[PDB]
Every structure is written in structure tokens, then in C-alpha cells.
Amino acid sequence: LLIEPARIEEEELTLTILRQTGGLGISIAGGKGSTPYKGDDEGIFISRVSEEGPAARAGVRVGDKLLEVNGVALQGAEHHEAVEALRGAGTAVQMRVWRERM
């Protein structure tokens, strides 16, 4: 018979993005008090990643939950707070993300 292979169900990664004059190449969703992006999770998510853009080249994938940006935690953050964090993250945007499978 066959056996289920080793499966990674969850990841927490640290990704470093190099912003271009155009920007990061993502779109974020969610926030405390907002219509949650996934389920009831009012956290911040990556809803879009531009192909071969900075975030793309850095390992970001659609659906990543955004937990922290350059040492600024986003727990319980509203959408605009996360927006202001990223707008000012600067050239090098080091984000910690959470990632499921499937």
C-alpha cells in the first residue's frame, strides 16, 4: 500500500523584499474591524502578488498572513495601521508571515 508523505501544514517565514520605485508589488487585506479576508481572522493578509515583482522574487505568496514588519507587530491592527506600516517600511521590508498548505 501507499503511505502519506511528509506534509508541511504550516510555516512561519521571514522574507526580505526590495522595494522598487513602483513599490512592493502586493495587496493586503483585512484588519481589526474589517471584513476578514479568511474566515473570522481579522488579521492582515497578502491578497495579491505581482508576478516577478519584488515580493514575488522574495518568496511571498498569495494568502500569507502578515504578522510583523521590520520589528512592528500587527496583531490586532486595523487595515490602515498595516497600510501605514508598509508605506513607511522603507527600502528593505522584512516581514514575518504565516502560511498554510493547499
Binding site: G23, L24, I26, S27, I28, A29, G30, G31, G33, S34, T35, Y37, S47, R48, H79, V83, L86, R87
Partner: peptide
């Protein structure tokens, strides 16, 4: 309320 597409 629904803010799902703030592009950056």
C-alpha cells in the same frame, strides 16, 4: 468595512 485590495 471590506478592505481587501490596498495596493503597495
Amino acid at each position: 468595512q471590506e478592505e481587501w485590495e490596498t495596493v503597495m
